[PDB]
Every structure is written in structure tokens, then in C-alpha cells.
Design a protein around this ligand. Sequence first.
Ligand code: CLA
Ligand code: CLA
Ligand code: CLA
Ligand code: CLA
Ligand code: CLA
Ligand SMILES: CC1=CCCC(C)(C)[C@H]1/C=C/C(C)=C/C=C/C(C)=C/C=C/C=C(C)/C=C/C=C(C)/C=C/C1=C(C)CCCC1(C)C
Ligand SMILES: CC1=CCCC(C)(C)[C@H]1/C=C/C(C)=C/C=C/C(C)=C/C=C/C=C(C)/C=C/C=C(C)/C=C/C1=C(C)CCCC1(C)C
Ligand code: SF4
Ligand code: SF4
Ligand code: SF4
Lengths: 169, 50, 34, 90, 162, 732, 30, 80
Amino acid sequence: ASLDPKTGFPIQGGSAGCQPMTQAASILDKQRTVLAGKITVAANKVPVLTAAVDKMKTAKKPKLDRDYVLRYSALYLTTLVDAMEQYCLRDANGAKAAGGAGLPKFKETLKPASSSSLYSYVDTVKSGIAAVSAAAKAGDFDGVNKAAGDIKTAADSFLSTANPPIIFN
Amino acid sequence: ETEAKDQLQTAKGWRQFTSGWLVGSVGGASFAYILISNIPFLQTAGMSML
Amino acid sequence: MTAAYLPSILVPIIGLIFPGLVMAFAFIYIEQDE
Amino acid sequence: FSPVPSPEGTKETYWETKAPSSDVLGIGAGVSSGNFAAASVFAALVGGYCTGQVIPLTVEPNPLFLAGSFLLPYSWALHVAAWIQKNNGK
Amino acid sequence: FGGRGLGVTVNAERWNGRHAMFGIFAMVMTSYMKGHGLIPDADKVLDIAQWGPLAAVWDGAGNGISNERAIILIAHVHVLVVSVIAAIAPFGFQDTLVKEKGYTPESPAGLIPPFKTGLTAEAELINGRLAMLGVISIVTASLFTGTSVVDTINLGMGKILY
Amino acid sequence: TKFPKFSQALAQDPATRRIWYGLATAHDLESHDGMTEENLYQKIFASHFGHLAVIFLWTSGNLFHVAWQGNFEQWVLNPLKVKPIAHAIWDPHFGQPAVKAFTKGGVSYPVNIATSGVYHWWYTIGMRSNTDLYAGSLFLLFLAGVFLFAGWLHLQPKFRPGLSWFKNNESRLNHHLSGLFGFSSLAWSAHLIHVAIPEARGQHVCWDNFTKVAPHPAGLQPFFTGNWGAYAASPDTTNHIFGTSEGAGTAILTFLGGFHPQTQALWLTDIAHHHLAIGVVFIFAGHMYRTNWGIGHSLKEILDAHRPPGGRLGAGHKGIFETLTNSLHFQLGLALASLGVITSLVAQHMYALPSYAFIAKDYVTQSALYTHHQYIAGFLMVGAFAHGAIFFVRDYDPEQNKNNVLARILDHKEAIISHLSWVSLFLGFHTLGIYVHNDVVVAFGTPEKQILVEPVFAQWIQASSGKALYGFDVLLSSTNSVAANASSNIWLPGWLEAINSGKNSLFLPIGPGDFLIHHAIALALHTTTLILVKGALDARGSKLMPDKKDFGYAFPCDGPGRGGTCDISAWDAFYLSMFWMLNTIGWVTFYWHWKHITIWQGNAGQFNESSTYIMGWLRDYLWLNSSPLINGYNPFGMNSLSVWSWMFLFGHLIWATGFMFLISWRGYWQELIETLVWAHERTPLANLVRWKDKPVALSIVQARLVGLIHFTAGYIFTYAAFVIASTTGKFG
Amino acid sequence: MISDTQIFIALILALVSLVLAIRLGRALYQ
Amino acid sequence: SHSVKVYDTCIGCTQCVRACPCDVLEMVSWDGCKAGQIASAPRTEDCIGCKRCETACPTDFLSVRVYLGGETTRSMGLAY
Ligand code: CLA
Ligand code: CLA
Ligand code: CLA
Ligand code: CLA
Ligand code: CLA
Ligand SMILES: CC1=CCCC(C)(C)[C@H]1/C=C/C(C)=C/C=C/C(C)=C/C=C/C=C(C)/C=C/C=C(C)/C=C/C1=C(C)CCCC1(C)C
Ligand SMILES: CC1=CCCC(C)(C)[C@H]1/C=C/C(C)=C/C=C/C(C)=C/C=C/C=C(C)/C=C/C=C(C)/C=C/C1=C(C)CCCC1(C)C
Ligand code: SF4
Ligand code: SF4
Ligand code: SF4
């Protein structure tokens, strides 16, 4: 019914029968639950960054770790945007993004991730990545904290409006 | 494997011996458990009097 | 840890049952004549 | 212990003479000793020139001078073949 | 080994059948048992101070086995000690797990044994094959659909257990 | 009576020797009853697929246990501060202080901290999350299954390779050079260029996007125009933070040289360009041999024609082709000598030129990896000489090898062995004498009197590569040199920065202590070679036993006659050289570890002053660094070094237990065992239980092997506990 | 993080590898 | 059992047979050596492998040659 906070897998089973032979879910829906689970893992790792930045600020001599903030951004924030862009792509063009147009390639000739109803949240997360990096260069601890919170709100908003089908399979 | 079972040094006799040893060992262990649980002196090392 | 139950379930099985069983079978195989 | 296979066309190359038979030159068995000696000197000069012109190596080296620089070690085997062919009367 | 009724034999088919019918009973019974909360202190995490390092699990919360899991395991230990005593020291009449080396292997049942409504061997084998398949069906259904095995047992029977 | 089904001589033995000898001869398929050559090569082929699968299951296990129980995602965020987790501990013998003491790594459960470096390797090659470590573990489980099925499949009657296939030397060499070495190095460049390079620069590339994400912005158009230098344009800046987009370039192939300034590892674009170069080279080398289309070389023709006309090698290599192909022991010896040199190269080049990001700041990992691969190196090199001895005993035919290089090596066997005896004695007398001279003079309060000899030849080599410390001004060290000018535009600026900076292990400063220890290693390598060479050359016979070949490779002795023939077999010279291998890898790893821990403190001068005498090695290395290790538990508590503290004692025990098998011999033990046989038969309630196999004392060769295994295992476990705990406890 | 289902997939593939290992060991043993 | 061989360099000195603790060796008529006799091994099943026969052999390379082989209760020297 939802996706696991850490592992991101389907959580509960809760004629659209979940059992494989009788599954009514498309491969597109299963790809969408995979992408949504990856979005869930990346978004739920935002509290870990918030806790780390609070530890940095409360130290006896406080310095922002640009390496930690930038590596966390590279490891989770970029991943969160790519997973959301792919979900937007599947929502807009449809089955074509699921492999209907073939192997992923340049000049894929399919509708872009933009023009999707859910794309505005992806723009919010992109602004969050830029703020996380800018604050890390500046040394502003509060900037990193608020920027991560903005990303967390945007990803939760994305999942809520998306209403992703959870395919236990 | 031999037909005769009247001796331990036979396949059937050692199987009967092992059967008896398991039943006796579980029963003896159980008997020790029942006795130690019931008797406070056995629960101690003999220092219950002290 | 996810599947934290598995170390409690497997480590005694792999560390006690596995050797006991394979030693028992290895003993039977080395001693047997035919 | 079992017959050891060799590719078809494998022939005997063990020698105790002054020079090995020209068959050890493979495809170059019929080349004259003058032709190897001239190819050897030509390869030494063009290989040494091509090597020398790109000794300060840049991120843009001339690919023809790199390929031509391989003629210097090739010239060594050419003059060994020249010696073998002169001592076989070729 | 194989000449003692072990391996892919009808003796092994019968014995694993008996264990799977008991296992289907035990799974149904534990589903009903924890659905009504009839296992005492089911969520209570056993303390290493009383039970030692065998109780540790490493689940982030609690770091110990729960009391429910320990209780089901102790039920299994009761029937395992019965199992060992029955394997090594069987009854006079009981079918034995390890048959004597020189024995007559019972004929394979075939695709279907003859149907006898009484407490017959053929009925045992039919129900046993069904129960072993049933164990696979429940274990796969729970695995595939991401539900607890107790829950899929309850769902199959129409929530009669709880 | 049927366990060694491959040996009727052992299967009719009524003693306990049958079990031991059946276990110890199990993999010697050549000696099995009724063994043909077809069946020998086909069982070796199938069991090589089983080794392939075991390696893949081991690697899948390391990946699975790190994906499941490790802190890889926490470590990749902050790789210099987080300690990598190998796997969790579930031990029901632990106390609650032990459980708390091992709960490091940022997790909630006891853990082992990994010294294998797999975190740094997986970080460098692209892996970012637990999902891709797990995906790698799954793929290796699939590959292990594929190679287990291949092993079974090539045992099936239609799929059984013939001996003509197994001895196709030219097709196997063509494919292993061009496919196994070359194309997989080229494919590894593709992995770096397509995956590891973009993910070192922040851009995720997986199977989900790698056909729609170009490694280079231009993208396969400069390659197909000859504009190859466009792939080196805009390299990674010195401001690059590994794993992120800041400071990142666009180049995918460079020859910058030196080290990435942050990770202190080789540039990944250098590594991608290395595997592309070495790939094309190996692929070209794999077109050397004639297979089916009339171009190429016959290996027979090359070997037959390489006889110098001066006659100094005799018949040269005539007949060496057949000997090699027919002899699996000659091949194993060449393979193991070759492999042993490489894993020594692996150990030496991975500490001086590390390729993995943020390793060489993991001092425990660097020490463990160097020690591990040098011990593997010593084992492989000793085994190469062992299988050369087995080759001479079992596979060498003198009539087929008349006046070859092999016959002429045997012809002067005494010149070879006596000159190895000379050089061993030469080095040993002087190196020990200089060390003892230094010890005696320092003891007498006169350190100045010490014979300290500078390692000028090696320093000249360092200077020739650009070290400016010694002021040699040779080649690269001299700014105005032909060598320096040539590499100036390509790799020299980075290399000079790397070599001259003292922050790395590249061409570490060498002084008198380094000279003395290198000479000690020379004595050790020469003495292990003397024992092994004496074993190989005298394998087939000696004045003491002329017909030694008729007895095999491993036999106890020829009895007490002719003065005494203990340890006369070629196996027994393997046995004796195994101690000398352990001693030399001991000297090598003691030297490496002491020099590195002193440099890592910032106190390299402490090695410089104390390494020139042996009490400096005893007090300042073994005694000084023992203290965190032997205090891993004490009456005041324990910490996470308790396991190494227990392993260190465990190694001392095994090692000493080995002495029992090596000093005390069979007749004593058989006379003990006969009194125990009497006692068991005469004891009431105990004589109801009877052995099926008559208890005998271990054999002479078996006990030499058991003592050697115990000695060796004690050696490994003691040093592994020391090298890991002293480095962990010190962190420097 | 790794799911329990992901661990079960790994255990399935390792069981398949165990069966193939048994089959290779029996074939090598003859 | 062990395999015990006698080579034609045997001078018929009878010493290896005297050394034999297990009556493995005996003397047979042979015209090859001056003594008119050569050692023989018709009882190598009793051979324990002690190699006392090899020690007693005065030939430069022992004419009597014990090759330790399969072990039995007899060749292991087992009184149990
Ligand atoms: C060959 C590499 C290898 C090694 C050395 C280990 C080592 C260990 N594993 Mg295993 N493991 C591996 C691979 C490996 N793992 C793989 C590939 C998987 C994925 C299926 C697992 C899954 C796994 C689980 C789920 C658990 C362990 C656990 C453990 C620990 C306790 C032993 C145990 O219960 O085993 C149980 C292991 C299995 C049932 C899986 C089989 C392991 C491999 C595939 C067998 C390969 C054998 C080898 C290649 C050759 C065998 C012959 C040999 C005797 C000569 C121990 C640290 C336990 C743990 O973490 O406790 C702390 C635990 O609960 N492992
Ligand atoms: C490698 C794996 C391994 C594992 C998982 C264990 C597990 C355990 N050991 Mg350890 N042990 C091992 C290897 C292992 N042992 C080895 C190699 C040695 C020799 C050095 C020892 C020597 C040792 C000693 C000396 C002691 C233990 C004890 C214990 C118990 C922990 C204490 C506790 O909570 O008491 C609670 C323990 C119990 C309630 C006992 C449960 C009995 C089990 C469940 C019955 C199993 C039936 C049996 C395995 C049938 C097998 C037949 C055969 C064919 C396999 C626990 C059962 C202690 C112990 O015995 O505890 C009393 C103890 O005193 N161990
Ligand atoms: C392209 C074709 C090809 C390829 C890829 C292979 C591949 C292989 N064959 Mg060969 N083979 C071929 C064609 C081929 N074969 C042909 C045509 C024949 C018939 C004439 C044979 C006949 C044959 C026999 C008879 C045997 C093999 C064997 C093997 C296996 C070698 C064992 C191993 O793991 O080495 C792997 C080696 C490497 C990966 C390269 C070594 C790298 C060197 C040592 C150092 C490099 C270090 C580098 C930094 C690595 C770092 C790793 C990382 C941790 C840093 C290997 C899988 C053997 C085997 O095991 O059977 C299964 C065997 O017995 N083959
Ligand atoms: C003065 C007599 C003498 C001479 C000329 C040689 C000559 C040689 N020996 Mg030496 N050797 C000798 C005595 C001698 N040996 C003695 C007494 C021993 C027993 C300790 C040895 C033990 C020995 C070994 C173990 C080795 C040699 C080796 C060698 C050779 C290399 C040269 C070398 O480095 O010497 C090295 C010399 C030694 C290691 C020992 C020196 C022993 C003392 C100093 C000499 C004895 C003096 C003698 C009593 C003079 C009395 C004469 C007086 C009454 C007038 C060479 C054939 C080596 C070889 O074979 O390499 C090719 C080698 O490995 N020898
Ligand atoms: C500290 C321990 C130690 C030492 C010093 C040696 C020393 C030596 N071993 Mg031995 N060895 C050892 C342990 C040791 N081994 C162990 C544990 C094993 C495992 C079984 C072996 C197995 C082994 C084999 C199998 C071989 C050696 C060989 C050698 C020689 C190699 C060095 C050399 O050639 O010249 C160095 C010479 C020395 C170090 C001798 C020291 C000089 C003495 C002390 C002069 C002192 C004179 C003084 C006045 C005497 C006072 C006596 C007093 C009563 C008056 C040398 C004799 C090899 C050999 O003989 O090659 C020629 C060889 O084949 N060793
Ligand atoms: C040395 C050796 C000897 C001989 C030669 C040799 C072969 C070459 C070599 C190789 C040795 C090798 C390669 C040895 C390899 C040994 C291996 C790979 C052992 C793997 C064991 C895995 C197990 C027991 C997992 C079982 C999972 C289960 C039961 C899960 C089930 C399930 C769960 C819960 C979830 C899904 C549903 C169900 C199905 C219900
Ligand atoms: C015992 C036995 C019996 C018979 C069978 C058998 C198995 C074959 C045998 C075993 C034999 C065994 C076990 C043999 C073991 C043999 C071994 C280990 C040989 C090692 C060879 C290393 C060489 C030649 C290094 C050369 C480096 C060079 C030239 C570097 C040059 C340089 C470069 C390029 C760069 C730097 C500058 C300089 C310095 C100029
Ligand atoms: S002692 Fe042991 S080894 Fe040395 S000879 Fe006598 S028997 Fe052979
Ligand atoms: S001892 Fe040697 S020589 Fe004398 S008899 Fe026996 S064998 Fe012949
Ligand atoms: S070995 Fe001992 S027993 Fe066997 S023959 Fe020679 S002497 Fe007689």
C-alpha cells in the first residue's frame, strides 16, 4: 500500500490479484513502482543530511563539510531528480518510455519529461540541489538545512499527487 | 546387518541399545530437572542449609 | 539490519548442524566398505 | 604422452649450420639477402627519423610518424633475416 | 543411504507428507493463535540478561528476539524432541523413518493413489502430497505478494481464523 | 574400505592412515588408479570451472555481506572518516561488553571492520549504493551457476573435449591473449570510460541510461576521425571532489601521471587509458599464432629454431615444446612462477601507486593488502619450484630432452646449486655480520662506529625517475635531460609532483637500514631458491640416492643406511623451503610495515636510526607496536582489538604446536599409541566400543606436512593479528 | 538498503548454485 | 605390500637375508656372481619396510631395493 522507508520495496499486499499469473499490472506500472521506491529511498535519506549538518553546526569550532554535502548531493539528490524525471517521462509519453521506443538512446523521439503534470516538483528538487551546493560553498549551515527540507517537501508532494501503484508481484 | 539382536555387538542390538539410551537419557535428564526444580537444596550447591 | 533474523537462524545451523551432519555422513562414507 | 598437435604447415626448423634454413623466415623465405639488407637500412633510417621527429611527444602527435617509428625494431629483425639469407646463398 | 528409504522414495514422500499436514495444521493454528492475541506478551523482546547471547537478533529496535517467536520455536522444539525419540526409538507398530537396509520398498503411488475414505495409507499419501504442495503454495503466495505467511493463511480461508 | 575410490592401495589399508592419505592425495588426479590422459585433462577442466565458481561465490559473498550488513552508503558519503564494515557478528559466545565493543561503523550491531579494501575498490569503479553492490552479488551468483553448469556440461559424453583440443597451444594462446587478457582489458576501459569516470564526476550512469548518456560530449566522432587527443581535452581539475561534479573535466583518456590530489590515487582517466593501451597491445599479441587461416607462428617452429649457433646452449629448445605441452607440472610451474612474480608486482605497485580512491589513508587496509599479497606471492613462488621438482620426477624424459636447455641445466646442477650455496652464504655471513656489528657497537654506547652503507644504487634509480632528495641530477631529476624533455609534455609534471612530494609511498626515502634489510631479503630469496633448486635438480637423483625418481616426489626417506637419509625427497626440500619462504615474507612484511608505520606517524627517522641493528627491530617494532594488540583484553576490560588479541595468541599456539610434529617423530608416538590400544582393549565398559580403523601414528611425510601447516598457519595468524591490530590501535 | 525479498532472491540463486555445485561434484567424482 | 627387488649386481654375500627381521629374503642359485647365489624376495607380504637389507648391502648401489607401497596390518608392524 506504500513503499518501505529505507529499502523502498512494496510493503503489504493489503481481478487485480497480486499473484503473478493473475496480475493485472502493466510492466509500465511495475517500472513506476520501481521508480517511486527509488524516490522514497532518496527522500527518506534527507533527514540523515539534516542531522549531519546539525552536528557540524553545534561543534566547538564549526565548519561546513563541503565534501560531505556535495557527496550526499551527488549520491542521493541527483538520483532523486533522475528517478522523478523518469516517472514524469512515463506519465507524459506513456508506454513509449517503458521500452516501447526501444533501447534508451539519444534522439529517442518521445515526449519530454517536461509538459508532465508532476514536473513542477522536479523543478523544485533541482532548485534544492543548487541551493545545497551554493550553501556548501558559502559555508551556510542553515542554507543546507532549509534546502534539504525543500527537497523533502517536493518529493513527498510528488509521491502524493503521483499515487503510484504498488506492485508486490 | 545380522538377524540376531540378543547382543550389543550386533547391528540390531546396537540399534536397540541406542533406542534405550535415548529414552533413558531424556527420561533421566527430565527426572533430574523435576527433582532440582522441586527441591530448593538441589537448586543450591548444598549451601541452602548455610 | 534487514533480515536480522537470518544470522540467528543460519549461524547455528551452518556452524553446528552443517558440520555435525557432514561429519556424520563423512564418517559413514569413510568407514563403509561397499 | 599423446600426439602433440601443431598447425598445418608446421615444418622442421632445428638447425646446427652457420645459418638456419630460410624456412624460419616464414613468408620471407624467398626474399633475397640484398632485399632484406636494403629494407633493413631503409627501415632503420625512416624508423629513426619518424622516432626522432616525435621525441617530445605532444597530445597531438603525427600518427604516421608513430606508425613509422615501429620500423626501428622491425629493422633489427630485417638485418637478422639479411644475415640468414646471405648465408643461404640468397 | 538411498537403500534405507531416504531420498526420492515413497517412504520419504509419506514422511514429508505427514510433516506437511502437521505443518499446515500448525500454520493455521498459529494464524488463529496470534490473530486473537492468544500468545502471551507476543511483542515483548527477550532480554539477553536472562537468556544470553542466543536471544540477540540485531533488528535496529530492541536487539533481541521477541517472545512470540521464542514461543513458536519452543513448540517446534517439543515436537523435534518427539521427532528424535521417534526416529531413534520408534514404537513397535509405527512406520520407521530409516528402514532396515534389506527392506521391500513400497510401490510408488503413481499419479493418483486409489481413493479410500478411511484412515488408509493411500488417503495419507494423497493428503500429504496436497499438503506439501500447499506449503509451497502459501510460501510462494506470501513471498510473491509481500504479505506475512500468517496473513495469506487467513486470507485464503476467507478470514475465518481472524 | 572404499573411501579412496581412486586408490586401491589406500582403500585396503586397515589403519587411520587411509583416511589421511585419501584426503591428501585426492587432487593428485595423475596418480589415481586407471587414469588415462583424456580423463585427466577433462577432470582438471571441470574442476577448474569449480574453482572459477568458488572465486565468484566468494566475491558475491563479499558484495552481499557489504550490501546487507555494511555501511557502504554511509562510507561513500564520508570515506575518510567512516570505517568500512565487512560483515556483522552473530556470536552466541559474546558477552555484552564484547557486543558493545564491536558496535562501531555507525551501526547498531557488532561488526568486523574490513581490511580488504573492497570499499575503496567498489567506490572507485562506480558503485554508489547498496542496490548495485547487491546487483553485483546477484550477477556473480548467476556467473557461479553458469560456470558450475559449464563444469558439469563439459563432463557429458558429447561435450567432453579431446586431448587434441586441450593441447591446441596456438588457439588457446591466441584467445587468452586477445580475448581473455586484451578484450577484457579493453572492456574494462569501457567500464571506466562509461561508468567509473562519469560516476567519479557525479553523473550517475547505469544500465538504465548508459546507451543514452555519452561518455564524451563530442562522442565517438573524434575517435572515428583520428582526433584522439580530443579525448584528453579538459581533464579533471585539481579542485575535483571525487564523486561530484565540482572540479570535474570531460576527458576520458589522459596520461597526466601522479595522483588525483584529493583521493591520492591514480587518475581514473589514466587507468582507463592504461587498459585501452594494454588491451590493444594484448589483442595484437593474440594474433601471433597460426590457427586455421595460414597466418601466424607455430610454437614448435619458434622453439626449434632458437638454438644459438655458438653451441653454448647445446640443442637449445629442441623438444621443449613437447615437454611443456605433455607436462602439466611444467605448465603449473611456469604459471605459478609467473603468477607469483605478478602478485609480488601487485603488492609493490599497489602501495606505491594506489588506484583506489581514499586508500593509502586507510593504513590498516594498505598493510593488510600488502602483507596478504606478499604471502600469496611467496606461496605461489615456492609452489612453482615444487611443481618443477614434480615435473622432473614425473614428466621429464631425458631421451626426449637430449642436450636441451633442460638437460644442460641438469648437467651443471652442481654448478648451479653450489653457486646458490655460495651467494646465500656470502650474503648471510656479511648481512648478519654487519647487523651484529651494529648491534654490538650500539650496545657498547658507540652508534657512530656502526657500518651504515647508503643504498646509492637504488637512490640513483629513484633519482633517475625524478626524486630530487639525493641530488643525483640523473635523467628525470635533471631538468635539462633528454629523458626529462621527452616526457615533459605528457606524464612528467604529474610524476615529478608525485615522486618529490613526501606524502605518498612512491619511491620512499631509503637509507642504511633499507640497504641492510634489502640484503637480508636477497639472502632469503637466494636461500629459498637454493633449497627449492636443490630439490628440483636433485629430484630425480643424487649420490646419496641415485634412483630417487623410482620412489616418487614425496617419500619419507631411504632408511638409516648410507649414513641416514631423512628429508632426502624433493618434497622434503619443498618442506624445508617453506620455512624460508615464511622467513623471507616475514622480513619483507616486517620491513614494509615498520617503514610505513614510522612514515605514517611523521617519524620516519625512528626507522632510519633503529633499523640498522636488530634490537631496534625487536624493541621499536615488535615490542613497541605490540601494546595496542596485547591490551585488546586485560583485567580492566576489552575493546574491539580483542579478537586480534585472541588470534595473536592463537597463532603462537598453532605455530608452537607445529614444533611438536617437526621435532618429535614417529617411533615415540607409535609406542604411545600401542599403549593406548592396549588400554582401550583392557578397559571394561569401553572395550564394547571398537575402532574400525586401527589407530596408528601419523606418517613421516604426513607429520612433516602437519607440522608445516601448523607452523605456517601460526605464522599467518600471528602476523595478521599483529599487522592489523597494531595499525588499527595506532592509526599511523 | 536491501529488502528481505532481495535477500530471498539471493538465497534462491545461491540454492540454484548449490544444486549445480552438487551436480558438478558428483560428475567430477563420477 | 611393499615391493622388494634384487638386481643382478648382487654378489651373493647373504648379508641382506641375515639382516631381514621378517624372513622376506632367501638365497637361490645363480651363476651371475662368483658366490653362485642371489637374493630373492618370495615373502614381500611380510616385509615391514625396515630397509635393514639395504643397510647390509655392500654393493655401491644396493642390489636389494625396498619400494614402500601399499600398507597392510603386516607391513605396518601392527600387533593389534
Ligand atoms: C563464499 C562466500 C561466503 C562466505 C565466506 C560467507 C560467510 C558467512 N555468511 Mg554467507 N552468503 C554468501 C557468501 C558467503 N558467506 C552469499 C553469496 C550469500 C547470498 C545468498 C550469503 C548469504 C548469507 C546469509 C543470508 C547469512 C550469511 C551468513 C554468513 C556468516 C555465517 C555463516 C552462515 O550462516 O552461512 C550461511 C550462508 C548461506 C546459507 C549462503 C551460502 C554461502 C555461500 C554461497 C556458500 C559457498 C561455499 C564456498 C564457495 C565453498 C564451500 C566449500 C568449502 C567448505 C570448501 C559468515 C560470515 C549469516 C550472517 O550474516 O551472519 C552474520 C546469514 O544469516 N550468508
Ligand atoms: C560455530 C558455531 C557455534 C555456535 C553457533 C555455538 C552455539 C552455542 N555455544 Mg558453542 N562452541 C562451538 C561452536 C558453536 N557454538 C565450538 C566450535 C566449540 C568448541 C571450542 C564450542 C564450545 C562451547 C562451550 C564450551 C559452550 C558453548 C555454548 C554455546 C551456547 C551459547 C550459550 C547460551 O546461550 O547457552 C544456552 C544454550 C543452550 C540452551 C543449549 C541449546 C542446545 C541446542 C539448541 C540443541 C541442539 C541439538 C544438537 C545440535 C543436535 C545436533 C546433532 C548433530 C548431528 C548435529 C550456544 C548454543 C555453551 C553451552 O553449551 O551452553 C549451555 C558452553 O558452555 N560452546
Ligand atoms: C576469448 C576466448 C577465451 C576466453 C575468454 C577464455 C577464458 C578462459 N579460459 Mg580458455 N580457451 C579458449 C578460449 C578462451 N578461453 C580456447 C579457444 C581454448 C582451446 C584451444 C581454450 C582452452 C582452455 C583450457 C584448456 C582451459 C581454459 C581456461 C580458461 C579460464 C582461465 C581461468 C581464469 O579464471 O583465468 C582468468 C584470467 C584472467 C582474468 C587474466 C589474468 C590477469 C593477469 C593474471 C593479471 C591481471 C591483474 C589484473 C589487474 C586483474 C585485477 C582484478 C581486480 C581485483 C583488480 C578462462 C575463463 C582454463 C579453465 O579454468 O577452465 C575453465 C582451462 O583449463 N581455456
Ligand atoms: C682453505 C681451504 C678451503 C678452500 C680453498 C675452499 C674453497 C672453496 N669453498 Mg670452502 N670450506 C672449507 C675450506 C676451504 N674451501 C672448510 C674447512 C669448510 C667447512 C666449514 C668449507 C665449507 C664450504 C661451504 C659450505 C661452501 C664452500 C665453498 C667454497 C668454494 C667457494 C669459495 C668460497 O667462498 O669459500 C667459502 C668458504 C667457506 C664458506 C668456509 C671457510 C672455511 C675456513 C675459513 C677455511 C679453512 C681453513 C683451513 C683449516 C686451512 C688449513 C690449512 C693449513 C693447515 C695450512 C671454493 C671451492 C662454497 C661453494 O661451493 O661455492 C662455489 C660453499 O657453499 N666451502
Ligand atoms: C636464526 C636462525 C637460522 C640461521 C642463522 C640459519 C642459518 C642458515 N641456514 Mg638455516 N634454517 C632455519 C634457521 C636458521 N638458519 C630454520 C628454522 C629452518 C627450517 C628447517 C632452516 C632451514 C634451512 C635449509 C633447508 C637451508 C638453510 C640454510 C642456511 C644458511 C643460509 C645462510 C647462509 O648460507 O649463510 C649464512 C651463515 C650463517 C648465518 C652462519 C653464522 C656464522 C657463524 C655464527 C659464525 C660464528 C662463529 C662463532 C665463533 C661460533 C662460536 C661457537 C662456540 C661454541 C665456540 C645458514 C647456515 C641453507 C644453506 O645451508 O645454504 C648454504 C639451506 O640449505 N637453513
Ligand atoms: C569444494 C567443492 C566440492 C566439489 C567440487 C566443487 C563442486 C567444484 C566444489 C564447489 C563447491 C561449491 C561451489 C559450493 C557451493 C555451495 C553453495 C552455493 C551453497 C548455497 C547454499 C544456499 C542455501 C542453502 C539457501 C537456501 C535458500 C532457501 C532454502 C530459501 C527458500 C525460499 C525462501 C525462504 C524464499 C523463496 C521461496 C523459498 C523456496 C521457500
Ligand atoms: C624449478 C623448475 C624446474 C623445471 C621446470 C620449471 C617449472 C620451469 C622450473 C621453475 C623455475 C622457476 C620457478 C623459475 C622462476 C623464475 C623467475 C621468477 C624469473 C624472474 C624473472 C624476472 C625477470 C627476468 C625480470 C626482468 C626485469 C627486467 C628485464 C626489467 C628491466 C627494466 C625495465 C623494463 C624497467 C626499469 C628499468 C629496467 C631495469 C632496465
Ligand atoms: S629417521 Fe625417520 S626419516 Fe630419518 S631415516 Fe630413520 S626413518 Fe627415515
Ligand atoms: S646383500 Fe646386497 S649383495 Fe649381499 S646378498 Fe643381499 S643383495 Fe646380494
Ligand atoms: S625391508 Fe626389512 S623386512 Fe622388508 S626385506 Fe628389507 S629387511 Fe626384510
